Amino acid sequence: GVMDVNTALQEVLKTALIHDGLARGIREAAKALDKRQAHLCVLASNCDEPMYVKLVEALCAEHQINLIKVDDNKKLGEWVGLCKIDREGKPRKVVGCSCVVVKDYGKESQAKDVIEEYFKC
Amino acid sequence: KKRKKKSYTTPKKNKHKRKKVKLAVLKYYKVDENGKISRLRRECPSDECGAGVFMASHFDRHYCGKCCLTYCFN
């Protein structure tokens, strides 16, 4: 019954998969940011050289987005569940999406809201 | 009904596939010694198509939407 940021991160990732989302590949991913449809940015972990993560940070910040942290991108690639091959394959996600509203509009959740308020202000 | 001996022409013809893309790098250049955004979005007056749709890189061409808008420098 504890409240944690990572516990809400798992919920938001799974419900983003459930409600629209699923932006695999840099293609069809910048269109959501240009139309401001998406509301989250995903940063690949332990990259070869830090220019990739720095550029993702730049495009996240300049688009007025809270700097949401993602750790262990391989685990982040396992968390989607669409890997198939039992557990082999392990495909990750380049960016996140928050279309068609992440939660229900009639009944919203506080697990996302606490992180949103803590990061925005 | 059976094979009419058609296997010598088009030797296992391949399904249409132009390019296989992992990541776009040359299309993304926001390096102006400040890190600010640099874009070349151009759109036709309409509601279906806007600045969101991507553009085909060319020396003089603006591929936008399905309306086939032609606007050249002559």
UniProtKB/Swiss-Prot annotation, chain A:
SUPFAM superfamilies: L30e-like (SSF55315). InterPro entries: Ribosomal_eL30-like_sf (IPR029064), Ribosomal_eL8/eL30/eS12/Gad45 (IPR004038), Ribosomal_eS12 (IPR000530), Ribosomal_eS12_CS (IPR047860). The modification N6-succinyllysine is found at K120. Keywords: Acetylation, Cytoplasm, Nucleus, Ribonucleoprotein, Ribosomal protein. PROSITE patterns: RIBOSOMAL_S12E (PS01189). GO terms for cellular component: cytoplasm; cytosol; cytosolic ribosome; cytosolic small ribosomal subunit; Golgi apparatus; intracellular membrane-bounded organelle; membrane; nucleolus. Signal peptide: none annotated. It is found in: Cytoplasm; Nucleus, Nucleolus. One of its GO terms (biological process) is translation. The keyword ATP-binding does not apply. One of its GO terms (molecular function) is RNA binding. Part of the small subunit (SSU) processome, composed of more than 70 proteins and the RNA chaperone small nucleolar RNA (snoRNA) U3. Subunit of the 40S ribosomal complex. Part of the small subunit (SSU) processome, first precursor of the small eukaryotic ribosomal subunit. During the assembly of the SSU processome in the nucleolus, many ribosome biogenesis factors, an RNA chaperone and ribosomal proteins associate with the nascent pre-rRNA and work in concert to generate RNA folding, modifications, rearrangements and cleavage as well as targeted degradation of pre-ribosomal RNA by the RNA exosome. Subunit of the 40S ribosomal complex. Belongs to the eukaryotic ribosomal protein eS12 family. This is Small ribosomal subunit protein eS12. It comes from Homo sapiens (Human). The gene is RPS12.
UniProtKB/Swiss-Prot annotation, chain B:
Monoubiquitinated at Lys-30 and Lys-36 by RNF25 in response to ribosome collisions (ribosome stalling): ubiquitination promotes subsequent activation of RNF14, leading to EEF1A1 ubiquitination and degradation and rescue of stalled ribosomes. Deubiquitination at Lys-36 by USP16 is required for maturation of the 40S ribosomal complex. A zinc finger (C4-type) spans 44-67. The modification N6-acetyllysine is found at K27, K36. Residues 1-18 are annotated as: Disordered. It is found in: Cytoplasm; Nucleus, Nucleolus. There is a cross-link at K30, K36 (Glycyl lysine isopeptide (Lys-Gly) (interchain with G-Cter in ubiquitin)). Changing K30R: Abolished monoubiquitination by RNF25, leading to impaired ability to rescue stalled ribosomes. Component of the 40S subunit of the ribosome. Part of the small subunit (SSU) processome, first precursor of the small eukaryotic ribosomal subunit. During the assembly of the SSU processome in the nucleolus, many ribosome biogenesis factors, an RNA chaperone and ribosomal proteins associate with the nascent pre-rRNA and work in concert to generate RNA folding, modifications, rearrangements and cleavage as well as targeted degradation of pre-ribosomal RNA by the RNA exosome. Part of the 40S ribosomal subunit. Part of the small subunit (SSU) processome, composed of more than 70 proteins and the RNA chaperone small nucleolar RNA (snoRNA) U3. This is Small ribosomal subunit protein eS31. It comes from Homo sapiens. The gene is RPS27A.
